[PDB]
């Protein structure tokens, strides 16, 4: 009634990257207790985008993380009111992305609202040149702090060339009402682009995420 074993979501993003404004609207579905989800996203303003899709793809759903039975699933516990998160990503060539997100449960669906700001990407780097090829699998190190949940990630983007482009990521997740925090644990994440049209104005994504104890 709050969270079924199968749940749909709607997402809206408004963003800019190096000053290029855009909007994206999407719909997805997944199995929140199995840690799996898919979404289809559409660029509704600002398309086609002059930058790599991959810097957007991790901003489109942490209600869909499989947790062990003995770890409180802080973000699921926050619903129906939900939670907010704030993220900063520092890319190795100076690019910066800051993201703020609102998550709620309305009429049996999750509703995601995202605001994104990317700045200082080199005009000759892989993001503005669209030279990226998807994210390697990640491990998000989770820990409680200041009454919030924090996650840190060393994220690695593959390049069409071969080789690497790294980002350091830190996210704060906060429930809209007090919720019991877990201890430290890790979330293993894999995000795939499963389909896209030639210019990435329509993209389909798949993500699997699983929480694991990092001690014991």
């Amino acid at each position: 009634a709050i969270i079924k074993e199968f749940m749909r979501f709607k997402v809206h993003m408004e963003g800019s990257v190096n000053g290029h404004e855009f909007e994206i609207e999407g719909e997805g579905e997944g199995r929140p207790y199995e840690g799996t989800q898919t979404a289809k996203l559409k660029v509704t303003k600002g398309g086609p985008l002059p930058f790599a899709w991959d810097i957007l793809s991790p901003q489109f759903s942490k209600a869909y993380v499989k947790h062990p039975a003995d770890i409180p699933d802080y973000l699921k516990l926050s619903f129906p009111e939900g939670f907010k998160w704030e993220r900063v990503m520092n890319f190795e060539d100076g690019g910066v992305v800051t993201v703020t997100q609102d998550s709620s449960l309305q009429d049996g669906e999750f509703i995601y609202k995202v605001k994104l700001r990317g700045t200082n990407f080199p005009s000759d780097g892989p993001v503005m040149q669209k030279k990226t090829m998807g994210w390697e699998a990640s491990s998000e190190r989770m820990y409680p702090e200041d009454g919030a949940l924090k996650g840190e990630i060393k994220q690695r983007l593959k390049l069409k060339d071969g080789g690497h482009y790294d980002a350091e990521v830190k996210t704060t997740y906060k429930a809209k009402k007090p919720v019991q925090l877990p201890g430290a644990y890790n979330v293993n994440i894999k995000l795939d682009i499963t389909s896209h049209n030639e210019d990435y104005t329509i993209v389909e994504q798949y993500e699997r995420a699983e929480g694991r104890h990092s001690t014991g």
Partner: nanobody, 124 residues
């Protein structure tokens, strides 16, 4: 044992009578425990009755329980109360409470990681 569950209230009652079961959750995560009631009659499958979220704010009832059972939560004591009205003989069973830390309140038994020992309801 981060959640311990203790059911009580099992008793003999006459057809058409009513009983109030309770389940007290204790342990570090008792305050985040969503609790579900399941019943198992002798030589039969466990079946969902009703569940209520950790906040006491969302409730979900099997069709058999709608209109006649009421599930509520006292958040002071992390205790849930199942008021069962209009009981029939086929309601005879062991009633178990189960909990989870993921805000799940539906019928899939595998999503409940913590189980009580059960309490016997007999209607006759």
């Amino acid at each position: 044992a981060q959640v311990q569950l203790v059911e009580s209230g099992g008793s003999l009652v006459q057809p058409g009578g009513s009983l109030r079961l309770s389940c007290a959750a204790s342990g570090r995560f008792a305050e985040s425990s969503s609790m579900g009631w399941f019943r198992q009659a002798p030589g039969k499958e466990r079946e969902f009755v009703a569940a209520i979220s950790w906040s006491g704010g969302a409730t979900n009832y099997a069709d058999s329980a709608k209109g006649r059972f009421t599930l509520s939560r006292d958040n002071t004591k992390n205790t849930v109360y199942l008021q069962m009205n209009s009981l029939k003989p086929d309601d005879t069973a062991v009633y178990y409470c189960a909990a989870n830390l993921g805000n799940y309140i539906s019928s899939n038994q595998r999503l409940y990681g913590y189980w009580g020992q059960g309490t016997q309801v007999t209607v006759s």
